[PDB]
Design an enzyme around this catalytic site. Structure first.
Site, PDB file in Angstrom:
ATOM      1  N   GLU A  39     -26.467  11.611  -5.114  1.00 34.80           N
ATOM      2  CA  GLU A  39     -26.136  10.316  -5.596  1.00 34.80           C
ATOM      3  C   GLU A  39     -25.325  10.530  -6.864  1.00 34.80           C
ATOM      4  O   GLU A  39     -24.231   9.916  -7.032  1.00 34.80           O
ATOM      5  CB  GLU A  39     -27.384   9.433  -5.810  1.00 34.80           C
ATOM      6  N   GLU A  40     -25.820  11.425  -7.715  1.00 31.13           N
ATOM      7  CA  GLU A  40     -25.184  11.684  -8.995  1.00 31.13           C
ATOM      8  C   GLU A  40     -23.860  12.472  -9.006  1.00 31.13           C
ATOM      9  O   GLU A  40     -23.620  13.381  -8.178  1.00 31.13           O
ATOM     10  CB  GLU A  40     -26.199  12.377  -9.909  1.00 31.13           C
ATOM     11  N   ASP A  71     -33.934   2.101  -7.320  1.00 29.10           N
ATOM     12  CA  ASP A  71     -33.329   3.041  -8.276  1.00 29.10           C
ATOM     13  C   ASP A  71     -33.783   2.635  -9.661  1.00 29.10           C
ATOM     14  O   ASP A  71     -33.933   1.447  -9.943  1.00 29.10           O
ATOM     15  CB  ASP A  71     -31.796   2.967  -8.172  1.00 29.10           C
ATOM     16  N   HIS A  83     -30.534   8.619 -18.365  1.00 28.61           N
ATOM     17  CA  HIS A  83     -29.622   9.773 -18.499  1.00 28.61           C
ATOM     18  C   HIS A  83     -29.831  10.516 -19.817  1.00 28.61           C
ATOM     19  O   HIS A  83     -28.895  10.892 -20.501  1.00 28.61           O
ATOM     20  CB  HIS A  83     -28.147   9.343 -18.222  1.00 28.61           C
TER      21      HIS A  83
HETATM   22  C1  LIG Z   1     -26.035   2.080 -19.466  1.00 30.87           C
HETATM   23  O1  LIG Z   1     -26.168   0.983 -18.610  1.00 30.87           O
HETATM   24  C2  LIG Z   1     -25.257   0.958 -17.615  1.00 30.87           C
HETATM   25  C3  LIG Z   1     -24.349   1.991 -17.352  1.00 30.87           C
HETATM   26  C4  LIG Z   1     -23.480   1.835 -16.272  1.00 30.87           C
HETATM   27  C5  LIG Z   1     -23.509   0.658 -15.512  1.00 30.87           C
HETATM   28  N1  LIG Z   1     -22.648   0.522 -14.523  1.00 30.87           N
HETATM   29  C6  LIG Z   1     -22.615   1.287 -13.400  1.00 30.87           C
HETATM   30  S1  LIG Z   1     -21.409   0.900 -12.188  1.00 30.87           S
HETATM   31  N2  LIG Z   1     -23.501   2.314 -13.215  1.00 30.87           N
HETATM   32  C7  LIG Z   1     -23.585   3.140 -12.001  1.00 30.87           C
HETATM   33  C8  LIG Z   1     -24.934   3.851 -12.129  1.00 30.87           C
HETATM   34  C9  LIG Z   1     -24.975   4.887 -11.007  1.00 30.87           C
HETATM   35  N3  LIG Z   1     -26.283   5.556 -11.149  1.00 30.87           N
HETATM   36  C10 LIG Z   1     -27.461   5.030 -10.732  1.00 30.87           C
HETATM   37  C11 LIG Z   1     -28.395   5.913 -11.126  1.00 30.87           C
HETATM   38  N4  LIG Z   1     -27.742   6.949 -11.736  1.00 30.87           N
HETATM   39  C12 LIG Z   1     -26.452   6.705 -11.825  1.00 30.87           C
HETATM   40  C13 LIG Z   1     -24.433  -0.373 -15.817  1.00 30.87           C
HETATM   41  C14 LIG Z   1     -25.312  -0.209 -16.893  1.00 30.87           C
HETATM   42  O2  LIG Z   1     -26.268  -1.127 -17.321  1.00 30.87           O
HETATM   43  C15 LIG Z   1     -26.399  -2.285 -16.382  1.00 30.87           C
HETATM   44 ZN   LIG Z   2     -28.774   8.553 -12.706  1.00 29.12          ZN
END
Ligand SMILES: COc1ccc(NC(=S)NCCCn2ccnc2)cc1OC
Ligand SMILES: [Zn+2]
Length: 323
Positions: free
Chosen positions: A163-164, A210, A292
């Site tokens: 996924e990552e 998730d 993260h």
């Molecule tokens: C820091 O908060 C965010 C950061 C990015 C996004 N936007 C997107 S499109 N993220 C894709 C995450 C993909 N993923 C899922 C699990 N590991 C990675 C939204 C956020 O808060 C709503």
């Molecule tokens: Zn992640």
């Protein structure tokens, strides 16, 4: 064509009563999940690593031991990453694989690679070890009732690999497993022998967990064409609270909010969404505070929140399948 693909549209739950609800709430065990399902996944498990093989062996062994007749398949393939061509392995778990329709529960089991800053290792506790353990605990707790499966409708679990992003989140460096599997399923006729329908026609609803396990999560209702299902979760949570079956749970701080959303968040459901499959995306927004970082670990998870969501999810699957 054929007519059965349209039953998902008109499908309705078999609502459960106060007595059954108590039996569900009591039948799920948070500390069994914790010890037996979760703790062994709290390891580095990026694609290709030792932990990845270990996490996949764990998930499969925990499923294979159940009574219900789960058919396990690994979708293993090679894909170009920023670090060369690599091996990825999606785990698919299906009851009645020849069942025309399946409710599909999914999550990713890989963890993001981080170099070992300050002598620590990223174990992705919310992301997504807890969602994987929730799926396995669901399969355990519900096992007696899933037996019944022997509408042509059953249950599938998908644990996506890769996924990552390896390096930075982008179209060609992310979602390795779901992009492959969606394309595989799209070109595969279902049920077998069929002429105009694919395994994707058979996906009633893709529920993707998730980033679960932090306290006070809030889950927006993301898409137009899946909202009655979201509404069911809102109802199940309400009723479970009223019946007094949740813990450390207030109605002011409800998980499922009929708050709508701007952007979609990119995740494993997107290559299925792009092919026209209905999706319930159970990801919180705000993301956990630990997202993260090395602090996304066991000590920052919240027992009661996970227990509550487990109760709610297990009810939801019991209602969707009429069990
Ligand atoms: C820091 O908060 C965010 C950061 C990015 C996004 N936007 C997107 S499109 N993220 C894709 C995450 C993909 N993923 C899922 C699990 N590991 C990675 C939204 C956020 O808060 C709503
Ligand atoms: Zn992640």
């Amino acid at each position: 064509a054929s007519a059965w693909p349209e039953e998902k549209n008109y499908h309705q739950p078999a609502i459960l009563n106060s007595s059954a609800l108590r039996q569900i709430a009591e039948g799920t065990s948070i500390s069994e999940m914790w010890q037996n399902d979760l703790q062994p996944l709290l390891i580095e498990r990026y694609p290709g690593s030792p932990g990845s093989y270990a996490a996949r062996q764990h998930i499969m062994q925990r499923i294979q031991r159940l009574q219900a007749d789960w058919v396990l398949e690994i979708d293993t393939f090679l894909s170009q990453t920023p670090y060369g061509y690599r091996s990825f392995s999606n785990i698919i778990s299906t009851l009645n694989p020849t069942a025309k329709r399946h409710l599909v529960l999914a999550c990713h089991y890989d963890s993001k690679y981080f170099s070992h800053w300050n002598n620590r290792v990223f174990v992705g506790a919310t992301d997504s070890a807890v969602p994987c353990a929730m799926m396995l605990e669901l399969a355990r707790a519900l096992d007696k009732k899933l037996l019944s499966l022997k509408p042509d409708l059953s249950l599938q679990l998908i644990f996506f690999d890769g996924e990552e992003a390896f390096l930075h989140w982008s179209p060609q460096d992310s979602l390795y497993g779901s992009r492959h599997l969606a394309a595989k399923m799209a070109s595969t006729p279902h049920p077998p022998g069929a002429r105009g329908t694919s395994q994707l026609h058979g996906m009633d609803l893709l529920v993707l967990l998730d980033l679960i396990g932090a306290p006070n999560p809030t889950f927006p209702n993301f898409f137009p064409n899946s909202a009655r299902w979201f509404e069911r979760l809102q109802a199940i949570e309400h009723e479970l609270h009223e019946l007094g079956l949740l813990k450390d749970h207030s109605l002011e701080g409800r998980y499922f909010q009929n708050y709508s959303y701007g952007g979609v968040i990119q995740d494993d459901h997107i290559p299925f969404l792009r092919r026209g499959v209905p999706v319930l995306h159970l990801i919180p927004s705000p993301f956990p505070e630990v997202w993260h970082t090395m602090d996304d670990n066991e000590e920052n998870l919240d027992e009661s929140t996970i227990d509550n969501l487990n109760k709610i999810l297990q009810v939801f699957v019991l209602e969707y399948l009429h069990l």
